Amino acid sequence: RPATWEESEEGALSKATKYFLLAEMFRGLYVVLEQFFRAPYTIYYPFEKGPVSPRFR
Amino acid sequence: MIINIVEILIFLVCVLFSVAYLTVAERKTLAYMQRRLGPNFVGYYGLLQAFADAVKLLLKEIVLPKESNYIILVISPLITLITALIGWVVIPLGPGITLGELNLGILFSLAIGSLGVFGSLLSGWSSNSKYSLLGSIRSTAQLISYELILTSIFIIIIMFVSSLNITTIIETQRVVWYCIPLLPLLLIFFIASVAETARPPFDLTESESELVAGYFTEYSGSPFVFFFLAEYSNIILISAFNGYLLLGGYLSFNYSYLFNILFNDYSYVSFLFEGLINSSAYAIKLVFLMFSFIWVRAAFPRFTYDNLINFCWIILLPLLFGIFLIIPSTLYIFDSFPTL
Amino acid sequence: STPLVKTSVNYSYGDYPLIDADPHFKRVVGYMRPSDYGVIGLATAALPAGICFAEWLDPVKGKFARPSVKFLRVATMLGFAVGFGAAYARSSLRFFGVTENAREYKKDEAQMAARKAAGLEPYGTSSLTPELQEIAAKNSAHSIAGLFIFPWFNFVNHPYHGRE
Amino acid sequence: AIPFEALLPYGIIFGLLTAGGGAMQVLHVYRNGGVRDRFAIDQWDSQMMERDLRLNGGQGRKQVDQATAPEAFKHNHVWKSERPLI
Amino acid sequence: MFIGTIILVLSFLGFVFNRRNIILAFICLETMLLGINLILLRNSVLFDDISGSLFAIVIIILAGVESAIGLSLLVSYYRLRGVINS
Amino acid sequence: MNTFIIFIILIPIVGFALLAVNILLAVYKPYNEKLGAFECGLTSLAFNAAFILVAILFLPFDLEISTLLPYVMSIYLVSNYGFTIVLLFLLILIIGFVYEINTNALKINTDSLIYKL
Amino acid sequence: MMYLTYYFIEITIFLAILCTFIISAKNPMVSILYMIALFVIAAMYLYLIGLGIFSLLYIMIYIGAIAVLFLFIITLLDNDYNTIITQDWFNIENTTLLTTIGNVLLTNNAFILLVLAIVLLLGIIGPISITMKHK
Amino acid sequence: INANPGFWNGPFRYLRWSAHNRPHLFFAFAIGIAGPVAALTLTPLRRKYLYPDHSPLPQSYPLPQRAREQLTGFDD
Amino acid sequence: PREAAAHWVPFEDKANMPDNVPDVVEVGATSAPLLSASYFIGAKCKPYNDDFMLCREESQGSGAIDCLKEGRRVTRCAVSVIEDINKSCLDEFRLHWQCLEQNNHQLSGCRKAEALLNKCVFTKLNLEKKIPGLRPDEEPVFLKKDPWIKPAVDDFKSVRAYAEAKKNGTL
């Protein structure tokens, strides 16, 4: 059975902190920002070329 | 007269080129957050990309659909661009350093902002494409609703200063930036400036996936240039409002000690060095804000119309009225009503 | 606490001597008689008793049913408000010298004499400037006359009390 | 790493605003004659500045600290003739 | 006194001789309030008196609420009929 | 003729100049099929109350917010008196806001299966 | 140049006559746009007579809210002498029109303010009462 | 599942329910009401202990409340 | 009185005083020197200013023509004190009022030059700067050390002179 509000482990104040300060949204923003400092994947066609195999058609 | 002309040309050129390069900066930043490169080919390191798009659009034919009021369809983008640019006349880059030093600077900002919903309200009537009409009504609703939040934060800040001169509001912040005592108010101004600008996640106004394109579905050539330019200029301008209301404007740090070391009397060198310091502080604040607009665009999915209306009118507005009650109460408790 | 404007002195609003032309809220509640508390209690009882009797006379839905607790709670709240308004009005009218005020007059004389002995202002010290005190006085003077329309009180320690 | 090509447009905007503000500072100072600008000036300040113009010979914001006024100060008083607000 | 008076009278005549539309009627109401207020404000300035401007502010607010209520009435009228044929 | 007015005049001139450049340089070949309105590529009105209601309630709330401008420009001069007055004003408006919330003004098959045996 | 600022008042008057195009407009929209133009002319005249703050308040309210509502709804539904200007120095404060309005409205006329609060309360309750169907 | 328990049935339970299930309204009301109550309750404490209120600033020329005392000095 | 509106021209009157009126010297200092010297002018000329204002009140409307004499007295007192400053403390006076010219005339931006000027004037003219109406608990802001509010750039010449005075012991 789904639990009711009164049987919740977290206090209302902590839940309200997460609610008003957008905790998971800031976690998402941080994960996005981490990509900004990684090596990109692009290659510079037509000066470079993607992989080609003997079987290519 | 000559000096006035040179100042206006310098300021206008800086603003127009900053808007032009904000588009390139957006593409490049989103690109690197998406593990790709973005424009790096039209001009060295993709620095001429914006002018390439400009020239192309100025060479594009203007299409006036059959059921359209052509005068309104061509003039609506023009008025929204004009107001978006007129808003810049009061922004200071240093004490008194602005094109318009008005004692009613704040009131001017709010008024010219309130003149910003007319492009959305008029284009849907002008296009007559149905997608444009739905977008136009929903946008007008969203924009006015969030303009309320922005005006309310303006009022809360003036509660601390008791002045409608922008430079004075900035000067009062040498003691502390107002984003320190009012951090929650700064969060709300960002969430609302995003919405008032119609940016993602709150891009319901011109969202390609719900409605193809948006109110601009029918806008080709220079009218599209105008909507584009007005949108990015408004982004920068509302970042400016944020800057001087909450981030201390052109204030960075107390450089009195440093100047007393470097110089021994007033000179054009020292005035220029001070001007550069103030302007650099204000421009770095603008840059962080624009980066944050782009960051939020990269990170979140869109809202629905019901969702954002519910947000503004049931979660934000009650909190703002509560703050209306609690700020003067704290002033009264500690006997700190600000003088004129 | 020096008056900026001239006021009438010991003007007769009625047949009895004047105690205070614009009494402070604390005085008006402080000088209230047991009869005034009886008035408050009577209003507090009367309003829900009124709703119940009205239901008795002409039931809302044909069949008699006692009014719900929400409405009765409402009833008590509003009845207390009416009773307090009536009682405040009675006490203020005593202060103006419109009803019988011997007890209140004596108590005021004693309190004023004690305050003078202590060196304090007869009407207290205000956190407002004198101009704001005159404005507060002109806003609160005889405001009990509009008890039917709007509630307005004197919360400001001003010197315009119409005495010597 | 820090992607410098992504920062180039930001650097362009930053330099543009910084240089524009510095040039505006120099132009304002040059217009003022070697002193900083006067901001948030009320009616009192405007009238004081007009009196200053009467005193220093019309040389803008130039200041004189001689105790006694020249002779022409007594005669160069100005009232303003304002058109009927119809 | 001149601009306000003419706005008032022309909006009044537009209202009365309207035989085109009801929106013209709303607009004549608003513009009449405008002209009243302009006359009021000119008089305020000529007297250097604040009561005129205070009443101007109150008119502004009341015209706001009047516009809100009037448009709500028009919408409720439309809900039954679907079309405004004036 | 200060910088303010010159800038204000200059902006629309720039807008008109860009528009005139577009008109002068771009081709202009209208024809019936191009002039059609775009709806996903092929040719082809009741609304809800909350649409009306957001717009209509914007005006009172805007007036409420803008009625505090005189207050914040005169806070010190009105002292602890004006303070109390503006609290009462705000609470009276908050009551209307409560009414709006509780009436849910801006917001836009569970039966069981019974067999007669 | 001097005749410009001199006749500026008379020009706003003439443009106001002309704009009051509101009555003769074929399209009610167009009539509303001309109403906005009239309001901008009003803001221009207000600045000229010395009341610029009112120019900005008019722009804020009548154009920013009332004209916006108008458009929302209709998209949805089918004396030759010159005055002497003299100076004196008795005013040491920086008191402007807005500050004085706040002062009188919040102290001398607090009652008018609270009654305006009731009027705005009406401007909230009424539209809800007649545009919304309960239950 | 969770539902309004009624304020009048139990005050503190309803407050807990509100704080868990309508945090926006609960905290909006809390912040709004904390202001005036804190004003009334705490301002006299501040006056008594932290620091008294300031002396009023001048608004106009302070005229002496006395008669002209003629004068002698700095004459013709 | 209100400021001028849409179109105004300034006009100058070429007549002389009527010869019955005794002539008087006019104060020649401008806004920055005047604001610098204001506290000393007040301290010295308070009785004459008060008498002038009382005359203007008692005249009950004819103040301009009935209160010329003690107006001449006021202007003469002002010119006297300014002359004394020009004779005794000129360099510090210039420091102070040039600093004010640089800092939008805010006394908060010129505390260093103001300390020197105040000491010089107290020692050589026996005038003290004082802010009326403060209780003993309240501290005059111009005497306060470590203020919250500080100027953007401490004036170069004023800083040098202040450090020099600290060495000499005058300050």
mmCIF file of C-alpha atoms in Angstrom, chain I residues 3-108:
data_model
loop_
_atom_site.group_PDB
_atom_site.id
_atom_site.type_symbol
_atom_site.label_atom_id
_atom_site.label_comp_id
_atom_site.label_asym_id
_atom_site.label_seq_id
_atom_site.Cartn_x
_atom_site.Cartn_y
_atom_site.Cartn_z
ATOM 1 C CA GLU I 3 10.921 74.757 -11.948
ATOM 2 C CA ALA I 4 10.291 76.129 -15.410
ATOM 3 C CA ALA I 5 8.283 74.158 -17.955
ATOM 4 C CA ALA I 6 8.024 73.560 -21.663
ATOM 5 C CA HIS I 7 9.501 76.799 -23.102
ATOM 6 C CA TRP I 8 11.310 79.450 -21.090
ATOM 7 C CA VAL I 9 13.938 82.089 -21.797
ATOM 8 C CA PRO I 10 16.190 83.523 -19.075
ATOM 9 C CA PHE I 11 16.158 87.303 -18.978
ATOM 10 C CA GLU I 12 18.450 89.767 -17.219
ATOM 11 C CA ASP I 13 17.500 93.065 -15.567
ATOM 12 C CA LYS I 14 19.897 95.945 -16.152
ATOM 13 C CA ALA I 15 18.618 98.354 -13.506
ATOM 14 C CA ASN I 16 20.623 99.269 -10.414
ATOM 15 C CA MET I 17 19.575 99.098 -6.781
ATOM 16 C CA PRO I 18 17.482 102.095 -5.746
ATOM 17 C CA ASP I 19 20.018 104.453 -4.204
ATOM 18 C CA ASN I 20 18.200 104.657 -0.864
ATOM 19 C CA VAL I 21 19.199 101.043 -0.136
ATOM 20 C CA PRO I 22 22.652 100.731 1.457
ATOM 21 C CA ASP I 23 24.964 98.746 -0.779
ATOM 22 C CA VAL I 24 26.389 95.425 0.372
ATOM 23 C CA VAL I 25 29.126 93.060 -0.730
ATOM 24 C CA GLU I 26 28.058 89.700 -2.168
ATOM 25 C CA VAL I 27 29.469 86.288 -1.316
ATOM 26 C CA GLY I 28 31.720 85.156 -4.140
ATOM 27 C CA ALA I 29 32.397 81.539 -3.201
ATOM 28 C CA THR I 30 30.743 78.837 -5.288
ATOM 29 C CA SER I 31 28.963 75.627 -4.314
ATOM 30 C CA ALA I 32 31.952 73.528 -3.252
ATOM 31 C CA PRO I 33 33.696 76.225 -1.142
ATOM 32 C CA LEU I 34 30.344 77.245 0.317
ATOM 33 C CA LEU I 35 29.478 73.676 1.286
ATOM 34 C CA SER I 36 32.969 73.345 2.737
ATOM 35 C CA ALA I 37 32.582 76.495 4.852
ATOM 36 C CA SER I 38 28.914 76.024 5.778
ATOM 37 C CA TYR I 39 29.420 74.679 9.287
ATOM 38 C CA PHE I 40 31.721 77.538 10.267
ATOM 39 C CA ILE I 41 29.384 80.095 8.707
ATOM 40 C CA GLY I 42 26.549 78.676 10.775
ATOM 41 C CA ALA I 43 28.580 78.552 13.983
ATOM 42 C CA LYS I 44 29.602 82.188 13.618
ATOM 43 C CA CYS I 45 26.490 83.806 12.115
ATOM 44 C CA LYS I 46 23.716 81.865 13.879
ATOM 45 C CA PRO I 47 22.313 84.922 15.746
ATOM 46 C CA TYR I 48 22.214 87.004 12.566
ATOM 47 C CA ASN I 49 20.595 84.243 10.519
ATOM 48 C CA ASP I 50 18.022 83.724 13.263
ATOM 49 C CA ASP I 51 17.292 87.454 13.400
ATOM 50 C CA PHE I 52 16.903 87.568 9.620
ATOM 51 C CA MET I 53 14.425 84.712 9.647
ATOM 52 C CA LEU I 54 12.477 86.157 12.554
ATOM 53 C CA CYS I 55 12.196 89.446 10.667
ATOM 54 C CA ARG I 56 10.971 87.589 7.601
ATOM 55 C CA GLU I 57 8.331 85.767 9.653
ATOM 56 C CA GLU I 58 7.132 88.851 11.523
ATOM 57 C CA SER I 59 6.859 90.857 8.307
ATOM 58 C CA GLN I 60 4.129 88.358 7.329
ATOM 59 C CA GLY I 61 4.506 88.721 3.579
ATOM 60 C CA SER I 62 6.547 91.859 2.898
ATOM 61 C CA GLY I 63 9.715 90.063 3.942
ATOM 62 C CA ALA I 64 11.775 90.977 0.890
ATOM 63 C CA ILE I 65 11.469 94.738 1.388
ATOM 64 C CA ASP I 66 11.232 94.915 5.193
ATOM 65 C CA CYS I 67 14.122 92.527 5.882
ATOM 66 C CA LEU I 68 16.885 94.089 3.787
ATOM 67 C CA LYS I 69 18.935 95.412 6.710
ATOM 68 C CA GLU I 70 19.657 92.219 8.607
ATOM 69 C CA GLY I 71 19.977 90.510 5.251
ATOM 70 C CA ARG I 72 22.915 92.833 4.676
ATOM 71 C CA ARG I 73 24.083 91.820 8.148
ATOM 72 C CA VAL I 74 23.868 88.120 7.226
ATOM 73 C CA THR I 75 25.809 88.545 4.000
ATOM 74 C CA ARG I 76 28.462 90.622 5.766
ATOM 75 C CA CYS I 77 28.946 87.976 8.455
ATOM 76 C CA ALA I 78 29.274 85.295 5.779
ATOM 77 C CA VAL I 79 31.847 87.290 3.818
ATOM 78 C CA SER I 80 33.806 87.949 7.008
ATOM 79 C CA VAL I 81 34.105 84.281 7.913
ATOM 80 C CA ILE I 82 35.030 83.313 4.361
ATOM 81 C CA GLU I 83 37.747 85.995 4.366
ATOM 82 C CA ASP I 84 39.101 84.650 7.646
ATOM 83 C CA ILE I 85 39.321 81.185 6.110
ATOM 84 C CA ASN I 86 41.065 82.607 3.035
ATOM 85 C CA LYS I 87 43.591 84.367 5.277
ATOM 86 C CA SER I 88 44.327 81.599 7.772
ATOM 87 C CA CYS I 89 43.605 78.125 6.359
ATOM 88 C CA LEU I 90 43.646 78.475 2.595
ATOM 89 C CA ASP I 91 45.457 75.280 1.565
ATOM 90 C CA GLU I 92 43.307 72.938 3.657
ATOM 91 C CA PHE I 93 40.198 74.807 2.513
ATOM 92 C CA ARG I 94 41.203 74.153 -1.098
ATOM 93 C CA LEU I 95 41.915 70.499 -0.333
ATOM 94 C CA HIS I 96 38.447 70.121 1.109
ATOM 95 C CA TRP I 97 36.511 71.827 -1.623
ATOM 96 C CA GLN I 98 38.410 70.244 -4.519
ATOM 97 C CA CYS I 99 37.845 66.860 -2.882
ATOM 98 C CA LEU I 100 34.148 67.715 -2.711
ATOM 99 C CA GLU I 101 34.191 68.674 -6.373
ATOM 100 C CA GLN I 102 35.540 65.203 -7.147
ATOM 101 C CA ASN I 103 33.093 63.227 -4.970
ATOM 102 C CA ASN I 104 29.721 64.612 -6.101
ATOM 103 C CA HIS I 105 29.824 66.976 -3.096
ATOM 104 C CA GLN I 106 29.378 64.183 -0.548
ATOM 105 C CA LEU I 107 30.999 65.032 2.776
ATOM 106 C CA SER I 108 31.457 61.300 3.342
#
